[PDB]
Specification:
Chain C: Belongs to the phycoerythrin family. The structure holds 4 chains of a larger assembly. Chain A is of the alpha+beta class. Helix content of chain A is 16%, strand content 28%. The chains are: A alpha+beta, B mainly alpha. At the A-B interface, strand 1, strand 2 and helix 1 of A face strand 1, helix 1, helix 2, helix 3 and helix 4 of B. The structure holds DiCys-(15,16)-Dihydrobiliverdin (AX9) (2 copies) and phycoerythrobilin (6 copies).
Chain lengths: 64, 162, 63, 162
């Protein structure tokens, strides 16, 4: 069921084939450079983004 | 949190079709989640500016914020559907009962439908590199099958809320 | 400059609409206004790096 | 972490009209830091694509990432100077030792100069209503003084880094 808890699956894709590693981020086995992270997280309210959409919604952007 | 690399990721890429293109597609959604949601909710408003007039569905930062939150939640469930080639999670933990709750709050189905269709168009535009401010940094090829699959997931959302 | 990527992150709050998050009253006042400043490490963002590498030649924002 | 509110907040702004415009000006930097930085570093490369050819200044994601990081670091110290009306923290914790560190690293000064210059122009644009995709949600009026001030901080950065 939809739990009314604002929780959503947050997926993160990693392609580190250039070899650049950040310290402490090796959380799994492999050395092809690829990883996927999945975790449930709550999605929060963003007063700033809301204020921006409220002022600028009438501006077409991105070449849409 | 699951971390999926090395041999587990090579396995994942076998129980899903077009593994490498699929991951590029997922990345294209999650990497752009904020502007997809912003541009989609902006477009539902600019097509029906009454939504943001007094006591409309997204008047006041709180209502507008709850909307942007909801669209991001939905988008992320779709992103997870495309990761696994499977919408069971989206159905179970997003869709089931969502119309019931929105009908009680009267979050209008028409503004939702339009926010959903713009998110789909936006996501499909990224996956096909028809997006104009940003292109993906992917090898060139045909991602039409996955574009259609993810459109299908947005369509389950539209259908459930209609 | 300590080579620790830390920078003053300034956050401006305007909650004059009355919508409040529980527990976020950290200073005195009844304005709705608050400025918060903390030193935080600014991190590397490989995604944005990739994007600028691909898309730098697209004029955006009407700039 | 410091919190400035009530009377604490009003010793920050000192005088009525300009102080509000200052808070709005600082809000506009931090609320748009990401795109400011992306557009300024993009403009750098735009004007000198050789910065992204082999062994150029921002060739490889690591270097590009480090540059975008630095641009935001700098932008944020500038936002703090504009909040506090003095450059002291920017000088001692951001600029002091910075050019010599760049020298050893091999970060090209010219590129820094143009990132800073575009960052300046972008921030002034927001403050003087010359921004075209996104307007600030402030009462209309003239902030030419706060544009001059923040230009000063950016020119301080330029003078040390160019
Ligand atoms: C994520 C932001 C983005 C980047 C970056 C990029 O390169 N493209 C981006 C977004 C994007 N949007 C669309 C399609 C639409 N966007 C809107 C809303 C805006 N249209 C308005 O009229 C307006 C109010 C004045 C908006 C705000 C709409 C309506 C669409 C069309 C959706 C539809 O029904 O077909 C896309 C899709 C590709 C394109 O450029 O059109 C993308 C990628
Ligand atoms: C946060 C992004 C943004 C929004 C939103 C908005 O409304 N304006 C925004 C950014 C912005 N940029 C500038 C000015 C410049 N941007 C560039 C880089 C781009 N020019 C290119 O040629 C290029 C590659 C093709 C780009 C990438 C440049 C050069 C400028 C001008 C710098 C100068 O010396 O004047 C502004 C300032 C006002 C304006 O729109 O021109 C803003 C607000
Ligand atoms: C209601 C659902 C709103 C909304 C409110 C949020 N505020 C959040 C964090 C936050 N707000 C303040 C300002 C408040 N605290 C004070 O002490 C005073 C002045 C005396 C003010 C006006 C602060 C300081 C903070 C951070 C507190 C801390 O650092 O621990 C918040 C969480 C996200 C965030 O940190 O910005 C929310 C949701 N947000 C909305 O979208 C609606 C309109
Ligand atoms: C719509 C999706 C795009 C399109 C995508 C393509 N990707 C292709 C090959 C490819 N992509 C990756 C990265 C990917 N694999 C992973 O495991 C992960 C992270 C966990 C990611 C982010 C790889 C490694 C590869 C293969 C190695 C390489 O080719 O460098 C591809 C070529 C066909 C194919 O391999 O299936 C395409 C078409 N291309 C487009 O034009 C649209 C916009
Ligand atoms: C070098 C500085 C790069 C860069 C690297 C970063 N990666 C960050 C987070 C991260 N990366 C992975 C993938 C990695 N871990 C694995 O186990 C595997 C293979 C099995 C790989 C390919 C993961 C899982 C994560 C998140 C770790 C977590 O969930 O805690 C990252 C951010 C660290 C931070 O923000 O604190 C960086 C900087 N980023 C760059 O821009 C350059 C090109
Ligand atoms: C240049 C920055 C801008 C612009 C700024 C103006 N703001 C004006 C009035 C105003 N702004 C605020 C919000 C500000 N005060 C705070 O304490 C904080 C902290 C969160 C913030 C965000 C207030 C409270 C006020 C005064 C109330 C009002 O007049 O609505 C303003 C008019 C100055 C005056 O009334 O004498 C300006 C010009 N306006 C522009 O057109 C550019 C884009
Ligand atoms: C934007 C596209 C809409 C708009 C949306 C609003 N939703 C509001 C409250 C709300 N949203 C949900 C579903 C949400 N919670 C979850 O856990 C998940 C999935 C896991 C989802 C997708 C619920 C249960 C609720 C009620 C409780 C809450 O706010 O957390 C909302 C505020 C309505 C109110 O204040 O009663 C809005 C404004 N509004 C629109 O006009 C457009 C069409
Ligand atoms: C972008 C406009 C430039 C660009 C910038 C680069 N900086 C690189 C590494 C780096 N930058 C700093 C200063 C930085 N760290 C701090 O703590 C502070 C201030 C609080 C800031 C301003 C440091 C210490 C470092 C060393 C790496 C680290 O400790 O994180 C960098 C990588 C250089 C390399 O090793 O190849 C770049 C590319 N590069 C450009 O071409 C444009 C003009």
């Amino acid at each position: 069921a939809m739990k009314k808890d604002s929780k959503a699956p947050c997926v993160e894709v990693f392609d580190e084939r250039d070899g650049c590693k950040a310290a402490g981020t090796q959380k799994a086995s492999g050395d092809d450079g690829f990883c996927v992270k999945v975790s449930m997280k709550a999605i929060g309210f963003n007063a700033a983004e809301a204020a921006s959409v409220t002022k600028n919604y009438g501006i077409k952007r991105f070449g849409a | 949190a699951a971390y999926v690399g090395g041999a587990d990721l090579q396995a994942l890429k076998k129980f899903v079709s077009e593994g490498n293109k699929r991951m590029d597609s997922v990345n294209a959604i999650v990497s752009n989640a904020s502007c997809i949601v912003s541009d989609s909710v902006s477009g539902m408003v600019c097509e029906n500016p009454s939504l943001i007039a007094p006591n409309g569905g997204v008047y006041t930062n709180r209502k507008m914020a709850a909307c942007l939150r909801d669209a991001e939640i939905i988008l992320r469930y779709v992103s997870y559907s495309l990761l696994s080639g499977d919408s069971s999670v989206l159905e179970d933990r997003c869709l089931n009962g969502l119309k019931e709750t929105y009908a009680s709050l009267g979050v209008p189905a028409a503004g939702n439908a339009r926010t959903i269709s713009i998110m789909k168009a936006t996501v499909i535009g990224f996956i096909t590199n028809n997006s104009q401010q940003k292109k993906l940094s992917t090898p060139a090829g045909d991602c039409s099958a996955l574009a259609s699959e993810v459109g299908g997931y947005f369509d389950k959302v539209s259908s459930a809320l209609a």
